[PDB]
Amino acid sequence: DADFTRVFTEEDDLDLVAQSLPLVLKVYEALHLQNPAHRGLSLAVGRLYIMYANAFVQTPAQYLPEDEFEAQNEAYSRARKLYLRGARYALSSLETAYPGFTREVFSGDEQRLHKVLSRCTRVDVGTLYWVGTGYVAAFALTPLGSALPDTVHAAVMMLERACDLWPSYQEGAVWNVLTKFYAAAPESFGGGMEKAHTAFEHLTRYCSAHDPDHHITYADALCIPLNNRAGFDEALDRALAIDPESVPHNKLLVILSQKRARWLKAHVQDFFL
Amino acid sequence: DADFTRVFTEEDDLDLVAQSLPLVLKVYEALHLQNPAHRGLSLAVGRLYIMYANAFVQTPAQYLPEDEFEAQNEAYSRARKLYLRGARYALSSLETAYPGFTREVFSGDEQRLHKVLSRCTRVDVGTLYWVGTGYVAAFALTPLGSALPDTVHAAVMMLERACDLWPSYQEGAVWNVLTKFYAAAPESFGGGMEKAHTAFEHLTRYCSAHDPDHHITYADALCIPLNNRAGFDEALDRALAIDPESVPHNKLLVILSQKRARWLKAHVQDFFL
Amino acid sequence: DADFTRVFTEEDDLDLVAQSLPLVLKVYEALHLQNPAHRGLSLAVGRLYIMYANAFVQTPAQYLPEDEFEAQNEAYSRARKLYLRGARYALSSLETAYPGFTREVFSGDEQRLHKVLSRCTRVDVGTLYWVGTGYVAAFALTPLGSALPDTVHAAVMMLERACDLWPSYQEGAVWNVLTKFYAAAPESFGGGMEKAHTAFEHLTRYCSAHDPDHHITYADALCIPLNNRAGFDEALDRALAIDPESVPHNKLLVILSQKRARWLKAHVQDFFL
Amino acid sequence: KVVLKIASIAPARSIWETELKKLSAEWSEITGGLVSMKFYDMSSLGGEREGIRKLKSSRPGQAAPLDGAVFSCLGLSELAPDSGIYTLSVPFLIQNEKDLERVLHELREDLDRPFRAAGFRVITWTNAGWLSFYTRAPYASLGQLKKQTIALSSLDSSVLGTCFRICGFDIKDAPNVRLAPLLKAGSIDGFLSVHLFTWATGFYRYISYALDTKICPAVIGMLISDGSWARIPSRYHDAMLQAATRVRQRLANNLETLDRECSNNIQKAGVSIVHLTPQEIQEWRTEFAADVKRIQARLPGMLNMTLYEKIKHLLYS
Amino acid sequence: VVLKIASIAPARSIWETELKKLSAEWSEITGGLVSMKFYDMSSLGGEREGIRKLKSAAPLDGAVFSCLGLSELAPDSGIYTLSVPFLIQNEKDLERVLHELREDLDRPFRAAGFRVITWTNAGWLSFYTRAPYASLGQLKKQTIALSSVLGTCFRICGFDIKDAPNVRLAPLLKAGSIDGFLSVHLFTWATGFYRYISYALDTKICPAVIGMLISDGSWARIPSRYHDAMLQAATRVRQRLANNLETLDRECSNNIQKAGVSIVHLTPQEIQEWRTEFAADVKRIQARLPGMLNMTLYEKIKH
Secondary structure, three states: OHHHOHHHHOOOOHHHHHHHHHHHHHHHHHHHHHOOOOHHHHHHHHHHHHHHHHHHHHHHHHOOOHHHHHHHHHHHHHHHHHHHHHHHHHHHHHHHHOOOHHHHHHOOOHHHHHHHHOOOOHHHHHHHHHHHHHHHHHHHOOOOOOOOOHHHHHHHHHHHHHHHHOOOHHHHHHHHHHHHHHHHOOHHHOOOHHHHHHHHHHHHHHOOOOOOHHHHHHHHHHHOOOOOHHHHHHHHHHHHOOOHHHOOOOHHHHHHHHHHHHHHHHOHHHHOO | OHHHHHHHHOOOOHHHHHHHHHHHHHHHHHHHHHOOOOHHHHHHHHHHHHHHHHHHHHHHHHOOOHHHHHHHHHHHHHHHHHHHHHHHHHHHHHHHHOOOHHHHHOOOOHHHHHHHHHOOOHHHHHHHHHHHHHHHHHHHOOOOOOOOHHHHHHHHHHHHHHHHHOOOHHHHHHHHHHHHHHHHOOHHHOOOHHHHHHHHHHHHHHOOOOOOHHHHHHHHHHHOOOOOHHHHHHHHHHHHOOOHHHOOOOHHHHHHHHHHHHHHHHOHHHHOO | OOOOOHHHHOOOOHHHHHHHHHHHHHHHHHHHHHOOOOHHHHHHHHHHHHHHHHHHHHHHHHOOOHHHHHHHHHHHHHHHHHHHHHHHHHHHHHHHHOOOHHHHHOOOOHHHHHHHHHOOOHHHHHHHHHHHHHHHHHHHHOOOOOOOHHHHHHHHHHHHHHHHHOOOHHHHHHHHHHHHHHHHOOHHHOOOHHHHHHHHHHHHHHOOOOOOHHHHHHHHHHHOOOOOHHHHHHHHHHHHOOOHHHOOOOHHHHHHHHHHHHHHHHOHHHHOO | OEEEEEEEOOOOOOHHHHHHHHHHHHHHHHOOOOEEEEEEEOOOOOOHHHHHHOOOOOOOOOOOOOOEEEEEHHHHHHHOOOOOHHHHHOOOOOOOHHHHHHHHHHOHHHHHHHHHOOOEEEEEEEEEEEEEEEEOOOOOOHHHHHOOEEEEOOHHHOHHHHHHOOOOOEEEEOOOOOHHHHHHHOOOOEEEEEHHHHHHOOHHHHOOEEEOOOOOEEEEEEEEEHHHHOOOOOOHHHHHHHHHHHHHHHHHHHHHHHHHHHHHHHHHOOOEEEOOOHHHHHHHHHHHHOOOHHHHHHOOOOOOHHHHHHHHHHHOO | OEEEEEEOOOOOOOHHHHHHHHHHHHHHHOOOOOEEEEEEOOOOOOHHHHHHOOOOOOOOOOEEEEHHHHHHHOOOOOHHHHHOOOOOOOHHHHHHHHHHOHHHHHHHHHOOOEEEEEEEEEEEEEEEEOOOOOOHHHHHOOEEEOOOOOOOOOOOOOOEEEOOOOOOHHHHHHOOOOOEEEEEHHHHHHOOHHHHOOEEEOOOOOEEEEEEEEEHHHHOOOOOOHHHHHHHHHHHHHHHHHHHHHHHHHHHHHHHHHOOOEEEOOOHHHHHHHHHHHHHHHHHHHHHOOOOOOOHHHHHHHO
8 A cells, every 4th residue: 555545546537446446445355354353454445445335336336316316325335335344354453453343342331332432542533534434425325214223322432532533534534424414313312403514614724735636615505505605606616726736635526526516516406495 | 275275165254255365366376386296286276266266256247237247248258267277286296197198188099098087096086186187167157069078088087097996085076077067968968968968866875964965066067957946945945944054064155055055046936937 | 577567568458457557557656766766667667657547537537428528628637748758757767867868958958958968878768758748648638828948849859869879669659659740730839741641651660560550640740730631541441451469569559549540530520621 | 927838859059959048048038028938858758759748738717837839740740640641751842951941831721730739839840850862772762762671770760761762762760870880881881860960979990982962851849738838928929929020040051061060970971972963863753753652552641732833923923 | 301411520520410400300300211321521622622523423513612622613692702811800890700691601501502591700810929919010021831722811911931841840840931820729739740840829710611512412302391490400500610610719819818928818909909900901802812802791691
């Protein structure tokens, strides 16, 4: 890894990536099952799955016509499954480092949950982000029940925990996932808008001005449910204003977000009165 | 290496597999051409082609609308070619071990042929199944004129021969291939229904109850030509009744078979009056 | 290096190739960025992109219905970008060998230009063909006016220069690219028909009778703009007359060209009156 | 969506199958998706006889389980016994593919008539193959051949085996299976077949000589119930009926190309190929023409003299 | 119904892109009925030769002609009236003319048995020169190369116009045999001739008009209904084309800027002052030639 993923993050041709990744997922996955105790591999393959599920499965399904919705439901079910697989691969990195961990956190006993999480150091922050984000993404592809799956609450605790150890991690990547969650979940669920705007301010602290993500996250997660059409447009505009050729890294993630912003701009009618 | 096909056999996501295999075939094939005398590689790459031809070429083409049949004929011609390439790659393992073998077997002399096959031990059974199955699959896709009489009979002999050495091999995998053949080929060809039911009982001896294949093979190969709609339905039902999650191993082959069973159930109309 | 690329050039199954290449490009590309000063790698990955752009991007887009032409314009933009990436990867092999080279040859001062080109030996001919062909291909897909006449000039000079050093190179591969260019560009651009027929005679000197390319190049580049329907048909016929099973290598390139010839035959309508 | 279930005697990977399938596709595209043909294996229905049964009902006004079929002369005659279709299998009457092509074309109405009156439309006619004799020894004359013991596969279900035995041939009833045993046992001198069978099965090994001089066609045989045809609208009829006529034609060509390559492979394999002299061809016809009577007493009808002479008047004039 | 149409549209041009988009937009209006296959006019051997091919079951049913082909088809217009210098200099101004005067333009061609699907612009004439000019007569004094026949009446206004192929241009310049040439910004940038001249004229003089007609007989093959629908699709085209040609002319005149050429802009005074120098030659361009200059269409455009 390291030098190898570079030829993906820096790529602006999406189909090259879409067609080449599946065998890379398959290869990392294989290596993992061979050396299960190797934590880096564990996280790598988990993160890969989570990332692929988002860009090459869930995302494409969002651009689907509304009458084809059966296909789109299949897609979402597919992405859900993949997010989960990723989360577990990453979770194994934790379980390798802190045996019993999976048992404790997912028990959903508030005393056991928070107890095993205290065991975590900045080393593990990377793993926490991905396990959390994996489960959180899957949750979003699930219908809405009474109360909250214990896994997702555990997930959100893992994220808040990485936040304690390392608020600046990945330019506030964790804050962005939380903002999106808090905004969506009811306060019965542990979310709410006050909680979400708060998490977003923190994003702004550590995030890059050359990153389109927070702008989108703002329009999508906050502006829409608050029926603010102005900020929505303005934010999406700020995102589409970034030259992908001027950005040091993740040219790919930029192209992808800008694709999504354009679609949002065009579908502005569906989110507002 | 064999820890490596694990990430394929156990996968339930078909597209991941379909997209990642071609480069694997390409890689094995390359390795082979580099060390042709390495028998394991020989068989490996041959089996891979035969398996891919079936799952990702011939099978998809069966689900094609009947008006599109030009596309379907191209597919079948494609699959035929691939079954053959596979069979040869596997056959080279035999030719490496017993020089002259290719020459003798296709000589089409009942004696010379009874001699070379007698040289074979349980070691070679694996190779015999795949060479036999490869050719037999190709025959099914071959136009009556172009079928080549000594050839076919060689393949079938190789399979009956693995049966002598190792009747239990792969839970009676060889019996399954023979059942399908015997049922299809006229007795002029060496087939026939008595011969086929016989080969099937043997399948039952060594096969798993958690394997959907034999049930399908039963409805498909036997029930249809005997115009037994009852057993057809009942057998396809027994197959679709297996939880893929309850035999992690072979999960892929199970998903694929269940897909095919559902299609068969839906097309029952086209198979009976 | 080339024991591997054999399993591609000799393949007649196009989908196997189309599906397995992208990860190979990705791998070579990665290796390159790791050892940038390794000239072989530089060229390899450059050639690979240029080849993929042609066969798997630009070509399929030509078979697209005329009402879908948005999709087709996207394709061409995509191929353009890829031809350029390839050209630069190859150009880095030259810049590694002759530092300053990129600066000079692209300075568009005739003296500094051919000066730097004069420093080249037969070793570099391979690199010159690919850099030249890369840019020339891109030019064909560039919107009128967005080209940069210095640059097109440079590419064509590099090709004419490989011609000086090694007229026979790759069975006159360079002549074929030039024929196509000369035929298309106006004499203001450095093309023209006299210039093109000349380059083609030279092709005939070194080219194979078993290669479908020159026949096609003849119909496509020359026959069409001269409104010669006869030669067009006759040449395409000579191409489709070659048995791909009888050729030494590039069975793949043969299958591809024959595909294109058939399409050309069927679209003859759109090319003549 | 109108779907036509049609029973077929077309062998598996065979080119008659390819061609039926191409017709179902050609028809579907003519009707814009309206009509398709699903084919059902006649062996699976338990024979042409059994298949005819599945065309009836059960009740009148109620739909048969089957809207059509591809029958050989066997099924054809069970369907309309006043037909006189077995008339084309009269030895040396029609020997040529163009000659038979001439007949299926110009005499169409006269052929279709018996079947239209049984409530069928004949979508098209075609050929199963040309009879040949595969033998262990040669024959310098016809009576010499009638003297050879020669096995038929269908036989008792096929009337042409019973009338062969009426011409003076020694015809023994054997399954396709006991053939190889019977030959080596010396219980048979050879058998009746088509070049395709004899090559494809590999029975060529077991006989020294094969007859390349065309004797007479095995005709088939595609009809759709009058009632099911009425389900397709009006318009499309002409269009799709010509599509099937086109078929007969590619079939005629390819069957020829195929019979030719088969008769080639058997050549290379060490079998020697016998070719009747233009003389003998005349000389034989007159030996069969003399064999009329004892047929009309055992198999009355079965030959339509009108139809005989329409056919004679054409080919030889 | 397939419409073979001859085209002077340069390869990757954007006039090509737009014709192709119209063929697609037409196809979708007619549900697959109508498509346009385009044939390269250079391949037919020129507009003249292409006119020949609308005749015979005629093989070509249509074409995109420049003023040259247009006038050979109907020597009534006069089509050259729009190229009167300074008569129309503005893109909106020419957009105003192709719109409001449509019938008056279409008339000569309807009577030759054609329908004009649409009009548009090939580009705006500019003068690319090695030295500047403080006045018109100063420019007429410069030796300036061309090659269509819009150049025979330039030589009648007092310009020294030398006939040269696109090819002998670069040699001729460095040889001092020419002071500069007539062209459009697109050509001068795209070909890289900008190198060889010091100054370029950005003040619009007059449009090169084209030019798309379909034979009256082939148009009758499309059914009644679709007509309105698809004739508006082409009108839409003229418009995107007007916009993009402008955007394009602008970027070209930019690249040539950056490249070291200096860009000349006529003061509003001079624009008036020049028109009156041509108007004095204009009454002289009717004397020397009838036809190409029409005079009613002409006085109408003034209005």
